[PDB]
């Protein structure tokens, strides 16, 4: 749950010379004292209980363990890691609304992928390198990177489709009946068709982008399920 995580750090005290048959450890109080405590600023103290543990199987073991339950104050990282990451992620969908004639789809999607990977590696440098659980922020960034790679592949496909002319490719009848008649209707496009083959190729490439813009908006919006669960 980084950066909204809560840590449970313990301090175990023992006498490394005498066992329970020689000295018995007792707790002066059930909690640690905060009478002269200086507030941290990054970490919020929640509870500092102390417990005296015996081993029913050993009878020579005694210790006192203090559980330090601390809660991270999350504004620093919510400002320096989450907002920049959400800002980067919001650009993952623009590539499908960018006209293919601008010749900048690759720049946009490649830059988005670069930024997401950089943020993922930074998060991998802030957290312990343990393989027990993955931060939800890291998982969400990982999912977004996979989506952006998929969008790069789709943009390459759409650019190939767009730069098609009747002198190099022939459009099959099924392509016509699907992409110029049926699919545009579902997406509320309604080709003006005021009147030539080259523009048909351009429109087909535009229909494919509009279709994937829908898919990347529902999935991206549904991506809040993988993000809103952290806070």
């Amino acid at each position: 749950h980084f950066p909204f995580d809560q840590q449970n750090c313990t301090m175990k005290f023992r006498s490394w010379t005498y066992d329970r048959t020689e000295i018995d450890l007792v707790l002066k109080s059930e909690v640690a004292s905060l009478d002269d405590f200086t507030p941290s600023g990054e970490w919020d103290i929640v509870a500092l209980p102390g417990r005296r543990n015996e081993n029913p199987d050993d009878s020579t073991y005694v210790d006192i363990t203090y559980d330090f339950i601390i809660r991270r104050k999350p504004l620093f990282y919510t400002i320096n890691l989450i907002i920049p990451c959400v800002l980067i992620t919001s650009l993952a969908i623009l590539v499908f609304y960018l006209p293919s004639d601008c010749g900048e789809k690759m720049t946009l999607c490649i830059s988005v992928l670069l930024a997401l990977t950089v943020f993922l590696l930074l998060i991998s440098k802030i957290v312990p390198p343990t393989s027990l659980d993955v931060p939800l922020v890291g998982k969400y960034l990982m999912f977004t990177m996979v989506l952006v790679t998929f969008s790069i592949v789709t943009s390459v496909c759409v650019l190939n489709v767009h730069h098609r002319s009747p002198t190099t490719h022939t459009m099959a009848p099924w392509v016509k009946v699907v992409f110029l008649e049926k699919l545009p209707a579902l997406l509320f496009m309604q080709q003006p068709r005021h009147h030539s083959v080259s523009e048909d190729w351009k429109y087909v490439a535009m229909v494919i982008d509009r279709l994937f813009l829908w898919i990347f908006v529902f999935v991206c919006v549904f991506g809040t399920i993988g993000m809103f669960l952290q806070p």
């Epitope: 059930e30 004292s33 405590f37 339950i69």
Partner: antibody, heavy 118, light 113 residues
Framework: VQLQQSGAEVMKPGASVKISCKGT????????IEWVKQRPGHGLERIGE????????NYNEKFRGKATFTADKSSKTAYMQLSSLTSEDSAVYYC????????????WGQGTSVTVSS | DVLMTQTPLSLPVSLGDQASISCRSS???????????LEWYLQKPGQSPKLLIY???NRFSGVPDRFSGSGSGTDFTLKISRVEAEDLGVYYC?????????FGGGTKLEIKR
């Protein structure tokens, strides 16, 4: 262990009152102090909490801004200050000792009654 | 804030009868430690509340064994094997899992005759 609350209070509308909860017989600075409001009608509403050792404080959404917690360590006392007392604020307020995830609200103050009237 | 609801608002049950109290949460109040923190408080008229059960099932020291608790992610119930005169009062469910911590609606208890 004992939580001692201040006496009953009567205040005019729009004023501010400050009630206190004094804890003794335990590590006062290591236990959260929970403040609970009980209108004469019905219901228990938790106002918020303060850890005297530090300054950390939480408030329920309904009471954000209405109440403010301050704690004194030299004298084992915790204070809640209510601002802009209306007629709804008239109720009985309790102070309780709480350690999250380990010990429940096992000790409660006697209860302080606040009445808002002109 | 997690919203906690109690049913019934009033529970009339004569002496010696089984008493069932149900509390529900607007969200799951489970916690990573393997425990979900739920507590039950009883208030007599003109008195400060008293702790009865904590951590769903664990029973506070010095309380009659008739009281028992049980529940899951978002549904919990309190059981009283036998009802007595001292048992009269109001019962609240308290969740100690998600900040801020909220009380239940309260369920008054009465004896029918």
């Amino acid at each position: 262990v004992q939580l001692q609350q201040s006496g009953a209070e009567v205040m005019k509308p729009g004023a501010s009152v400050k009630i206190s909860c004094k804890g003794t017989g335990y590590t006062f600075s290591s236990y959260w102090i929970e403040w609970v409001k009980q209108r004469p009608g019905h219901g228990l509403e938790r106002i918020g909490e303060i850890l005297p050792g530090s300054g950390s404080t939480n408030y329920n959404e309904k009471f954000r801004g209405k109440a403010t917690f301050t704690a004194d360590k030299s004298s084992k006392t915790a204070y809640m200050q209510l601002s802009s007392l209306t007629s709804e604020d008239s109720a009985v307020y309790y102070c309780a000792r709480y350690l999250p995830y380990y010990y429940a609200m096992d000790y409660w103050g006697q209860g302080t009654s606040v009445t808002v009237s002109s | 804030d997690v919203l906690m609801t109690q049913t019934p608002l009033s529970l009339p049950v004569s002496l010696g009868d089984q008493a069932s109290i149900s509390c529900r949460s607007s969200q799951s109040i489970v916690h990573s430690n393997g425990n979900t923190y739920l507590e039950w408080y009883l208030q007599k008229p003109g008195q400060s509340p008293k702790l009865l059960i904590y951590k769903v099932s664990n029973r506070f020291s010095g309380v009659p064994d008739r009281f028992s608790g049980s529940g899951s992610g978002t549904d919990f119930t309190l059981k009283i094997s036998r009802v007595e005169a001292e048992d009269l009062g109001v019962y609240y469910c308290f969740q100690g899992s998600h900040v801020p911590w909220t009380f239940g609606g309260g369920t008054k208890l009465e004896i029918k005759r």
